Amino acid sequence: EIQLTQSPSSLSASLGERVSLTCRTSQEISGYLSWLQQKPDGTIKRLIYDATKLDSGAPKRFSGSRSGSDYSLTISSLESEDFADYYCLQYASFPRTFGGGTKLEIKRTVAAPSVFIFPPSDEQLKSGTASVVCLLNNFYPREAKVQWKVDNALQSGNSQESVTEQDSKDSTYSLSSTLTLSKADYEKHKVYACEVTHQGLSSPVTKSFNRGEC
């Protein structure tokens, strides 16, 4: 199957900037390629077809070019509507195949997160399970590393996290991580901590509490 290799995977850029996205094919597809845009709401729109032709519904700041197995999507001057995900699709061969996508996000300066830790509620503890929550608030860029420790023991595989969409007013991200232990385990240990690293932090930030102590 013809593999489409897209780059970059993620791109950060500013309003007004010129950018190009690339899609490379494992075999010759002779121009049979389109560029698709997927909005943060999921909707998918074609911008370019036949490698270089503008979709009747797409604005003129989008151009397509190619040379051999290298296909590029260019945005002449970025607008807010353009921060979205982009995919290439080939239609020279079966099966039809797509590039892995490029995520285009708005570039801003580095902002260190504000970090907060929350112990399990008494209400939850009554029923057998303990959830510990670490909040990383309004940071940039999106990459952030959260480690959980229990009595200074590094934890692995018992946490889940999620990240918000880039903020419309300040272009930051926030992150929530939940550490799940059974109540029995939770009550067998004292010190609960979340250790955060981020481009914006010159040294790791650790927020911690001791169980059962206000």
Partner: peptide, 11 residues
């Protein structure tokens, strides 16, 4: 469940 405000939650 509440995530209650605390000293360990007050920047």
């Amino acid at each position: 469940f509440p995530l209650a405000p605390s000293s360990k939650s007050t920047s």
